[PDB]
């Protein structure tokens, strides 16, 4: 592990013992999905599976277009389609989904085992599986409802920014193949200025509220998106309006673990200072003067 | 001469030796860590080894000001006289468990007091070297050349005093009676007479005349 | 970790359980700094920290070219620079400063972390991160004093001869940059060829003390230098003459452990033994017959 010594964050990694990261002047990446141009072709989901080596079950058909249903552990991006007439004339949102690549994950923060979550310098948020033990908090901690765990190993399992493309030069799979260049790669910074350009396209044609979805309460995301409706997130099959690691999951993982280890040292201490000072309590401590 | 126990201990000096066993144990398995690394077990007496390197050093700067608080309750007790000299010759009696018949025993006999030296010298060669070869605070300002020195006499100090320390402890385990005195504070008049003759008499005369000092 | 199998060397291994080392028939490689071919340009501090994804801090003049001043963990290779009149004239000596790939490394003698500093059998003597604890010992023991802590993350880090370029078949970055060629690479076998070709034409313009640098004492270095001065290396911004393992660190390393594990087993046999022999020292042995 640590072979790339860019390691900027580790699950289960006390704070005073950083993992290696010498090599991390690297510039960020990030995906950048404009849903206004999306055909919800389902391309992304064939491609990735594709380079990934994984195939999903052959499932059915409950009434929407939208298949398989779910992110599953065989399944690392699923196209969400929306109809709708809530902004008042037909329109059919279509999004895709996956993990966010988050700057801080509360994956990551909710991992109890030592490396299984870690965040590389670029940005990219992956497992690594050798230590993962399958208790799921990850799926808990994360504020987009993204990992998924696998049956057959008992291991979490999710879009990994084709990190082993990204590392060595290449765009993801899904990026390449998107067949309208609705999904667009590149670094953050100039993902970014895309992304504002197509704001301001939209807003030119009558999107008023059109806007980058890239939110602050998880530190941004290196998987972004450009909404026709960003004042309304939950439209695009109920992405979260402003998203942020659970309250309950920041305490149980943040102050609950030192005032724990307090209590504990403090316990000890008092118990055995305690018999020190008093000293057993026998049937009779009186005969013995 | 009618009690069963008779105080040996202080608790303040209870408090403090107990103190420094715990300390003792994580610092002594740490650096035994890293003196010998097939022993990988050692490498998680401070839960990974990455914070074993870390906290090593404090506890053992821990362990010196806790001995200094010790040095400074119990030298007058440990300093070497002529009457220490027939317990150095008839050691091979002494072990055989019959000191009595050949030595005079104050408060702490001539090995004790060997022992408290060492110790004591000992924890003030660790806490140098140990500053020496501490990075990143202070290693940067000595010269390499001092710095190697340190850290092969930091290696055999620490060796040293743990050597000292299985001894200790065994005697402690050997010469019954004795834990219980360090954890409760009491000694038995009878151990008092067979181990520490002269001290039990210097104790059983403080108190009886002083007693006698009243004017009951 | 042994991915590779060729590991001839591993830091804190004892020597009855040796690292794998079955792919060892490879030859082995070595730079030649040539420093009477150097102009002293900083290139190969460019190259390396280009190539390496690191940036040293921008830092200060205090009255020299030098610059950084010192290796770093951000800056694993520096120019040195010597103003001498030693030898009767005006000579301005330049030495690229690094990790020396020493072919009995002491970094390595020195480490009391299993796996944390290896070496292959090509020469390269590597840190491999995740198992270092940043003690600082192999700071000591290095005859050359090249490894540098990262505060960031508590590890050494220093010119790793490029081994993810070599290891598929290219030259250094900072090799390869070299605009005067001075800096040149290859087989050991064919460096020092090149070493001694070039050792004679400076004998032949006047250098009769003109040298290869390649250290006996530390089993010869797969990074060399052609020195015009050989007879001085400490000109050379003080380049150690004779350069060993130190006596001290020999000992600590060496001999006092099997001594210090022969006292421990001894003394437990003792003391388990004396006890059974002997029996308690209770308060009456005698009220027992
Ligand atoms: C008087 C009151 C004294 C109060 C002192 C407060 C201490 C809190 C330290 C801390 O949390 O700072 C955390 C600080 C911040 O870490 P963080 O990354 O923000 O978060 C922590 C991690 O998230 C996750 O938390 P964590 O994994 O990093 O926890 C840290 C710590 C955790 O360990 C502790 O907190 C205390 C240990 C608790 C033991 C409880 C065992 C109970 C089980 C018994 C059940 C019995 C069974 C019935 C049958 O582990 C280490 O630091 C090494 C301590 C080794 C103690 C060895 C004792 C063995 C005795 C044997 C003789 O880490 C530390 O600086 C090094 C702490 C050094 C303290 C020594
Ligand atoms: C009668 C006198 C008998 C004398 C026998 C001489 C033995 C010396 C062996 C040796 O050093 O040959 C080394 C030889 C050469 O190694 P090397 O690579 O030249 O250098 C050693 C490494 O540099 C670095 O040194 P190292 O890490 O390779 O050290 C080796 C050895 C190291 O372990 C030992 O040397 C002895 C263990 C010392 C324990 C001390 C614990 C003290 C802590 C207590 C503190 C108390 C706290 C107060 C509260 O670890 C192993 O070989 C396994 C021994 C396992 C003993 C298990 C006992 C558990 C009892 C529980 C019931 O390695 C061996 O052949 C296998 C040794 C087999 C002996 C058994
Ligand atoms: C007096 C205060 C002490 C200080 C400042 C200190 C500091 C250090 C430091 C900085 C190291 C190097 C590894 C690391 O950074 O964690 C070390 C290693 C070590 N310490 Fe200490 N220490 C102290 C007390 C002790 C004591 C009481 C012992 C004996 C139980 C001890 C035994 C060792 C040993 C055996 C090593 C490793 C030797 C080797 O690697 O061969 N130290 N110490
Ligand atoms: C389990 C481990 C230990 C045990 C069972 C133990 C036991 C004892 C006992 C029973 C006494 C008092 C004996 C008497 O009243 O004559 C004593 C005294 C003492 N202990 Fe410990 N001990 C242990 C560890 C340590 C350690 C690790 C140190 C410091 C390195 C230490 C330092 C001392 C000192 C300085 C004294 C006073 C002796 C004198 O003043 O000559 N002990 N120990
Ligand atoms: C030459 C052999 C040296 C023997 C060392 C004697 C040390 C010795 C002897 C005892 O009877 C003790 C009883 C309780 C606690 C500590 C004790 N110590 O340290
Ligand atoms: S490949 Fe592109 S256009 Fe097709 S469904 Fe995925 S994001 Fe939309
Ligand atoms: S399921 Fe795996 S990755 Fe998720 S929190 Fe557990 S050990 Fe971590
Ligand atoms: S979307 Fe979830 S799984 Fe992905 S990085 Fe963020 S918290 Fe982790
Ligand atoms: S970035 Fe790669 S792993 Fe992620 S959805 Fe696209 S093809 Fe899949
Ligand atoms: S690149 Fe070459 S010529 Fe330039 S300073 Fe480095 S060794 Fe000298
Ligand atoms: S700092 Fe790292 S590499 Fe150096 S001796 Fe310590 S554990 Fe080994
Ligand atoms: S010059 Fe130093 S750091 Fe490099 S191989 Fe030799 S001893 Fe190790
Ligand atoms: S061999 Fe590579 S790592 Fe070393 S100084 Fe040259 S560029 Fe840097």
Same mark, same amino acid.
């Given at each position: ?6 390691? *900027? ?92 690549? @988050? ?9 109890? +085992? ?20 399958? @208790?799921?908090? @990850? ?31 290449? $765009? !993801? ?5 998107? !067949? ?12 970014? $200025? ?45 992405? !979260? ?49 | ?148 020195? +340190? ?7 620490? *060796? ?6 299985? *001894? ?10 004795? *834990? ?21 008499? =210097?104790? &059983?005369?403080? =108190?009886?005349?002083? &007693? ?5």
């Amino acid at each position: 592990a640590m072979e790339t010594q860019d390691i *900027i964050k580790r699950s289960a990694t006390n704070s005073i013992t950083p993992p290696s990261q010498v090599r991390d002047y690297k510039a960020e990446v990030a995906k950048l999905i404009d849903v206004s141009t999306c055909i919800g072709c389902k391309a992304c989901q064939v491609a990735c599976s594709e380079w990934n080596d994984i195939r999903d079950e052959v499932g059915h058909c409950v009434g929407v277009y939208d298949n398989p249903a779910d992110l599953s552990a065989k399944s690392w991006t699923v196209m969400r389609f929306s109809e709708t007439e809530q902004n008042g004339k037909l329109e059919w949102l279509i999004r895709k989904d996956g993990c966010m690549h @988050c700057e801080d994950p509360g994956c990551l923060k909710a991992c109890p +085992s030592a490396g299984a979550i870690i965040q590389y310098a670029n940005g990219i948020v992956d497992f690594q599986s050798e230590n993962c033990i399958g @208790c799921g908090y @990850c799926i808990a901690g994360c504020p987009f409802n993204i990992p998924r765990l696998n049956k057959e190993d008992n291991r979490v399992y999710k879009c990994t920014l084709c990190v082993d493309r990204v590392s060595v030069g290449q $765009e !993801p799979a899904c990026v390449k193949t998107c !067949p309208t260049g609705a999904i667009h790669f590149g670094t953050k910074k100039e993902m970014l $200025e895309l992304a504002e350009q197509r704001v301001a396209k939209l807003k030119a044609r009558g999107y008023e509220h059109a806007g980058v979805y890239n939110p602050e309460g998880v530190g941004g995301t290196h998987v972004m998106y450009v909404l026709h409706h960003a004042d309304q997130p939950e439209l695009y099959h109920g992405l !979260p309006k402003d998203p942020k690691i659970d309250t309950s999951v920041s305490l149980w993982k943040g102050a609950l673990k030192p005032l724990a280890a307090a209590g504990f040292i403090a316990t000890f201490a008092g118990l055995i200072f305690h018999y020190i000072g008093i000293g057993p309590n026998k049937e009779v401590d009186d005969d013995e003067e | 001469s009618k009690s069963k126990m008779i105080v040996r201990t202080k608790f303040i000096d209870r408090a403090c030796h107990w103190t420094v066993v715990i300390c003792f144990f994580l610092v002594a398995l740490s650096g035994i860590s890293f003196f010998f690394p097939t022993l990988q077990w050692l490498t998680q007496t401070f839960g990974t080894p990455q914070m074993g390197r870390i906290l090593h050093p404090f506890f053992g700067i821990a362990i010196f000001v806790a001995l200094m608080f010790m040095f400074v309750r119990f030298v007058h007790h440990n300093i070497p006289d002529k009457k220490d000299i027939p317990w150095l010759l008839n050691i091979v009696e002494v072990l055989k468990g019959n000191e009595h018949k050949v030595a005079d025993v104050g408060k702490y006999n001539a090995g004790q007091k060997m022992m408290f030296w060492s110790i004591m010298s000992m924890i003030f060669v660790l806490l140098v070297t140990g500053v020496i070869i501490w990075r990143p605070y202070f290693a940067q300002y000595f010269p390499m050349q001092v710095v190697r020195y +340190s850290l092969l006499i930091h290696a055999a100090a620490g *060796i040293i005093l743990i050597h000292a320390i299985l *001894i200790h402890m065994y005697m402690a385990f050997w010469v019954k009676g004795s *834990i219980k005195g360090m954890i409760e504070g009491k000694v038995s008049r009878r151990w008092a007479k067979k181990h520490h003759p002269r001290w039990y008499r =210097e104790i &059983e005369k403080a =108190e009886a005349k002083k &007693e006698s000092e009243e004017g009951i």
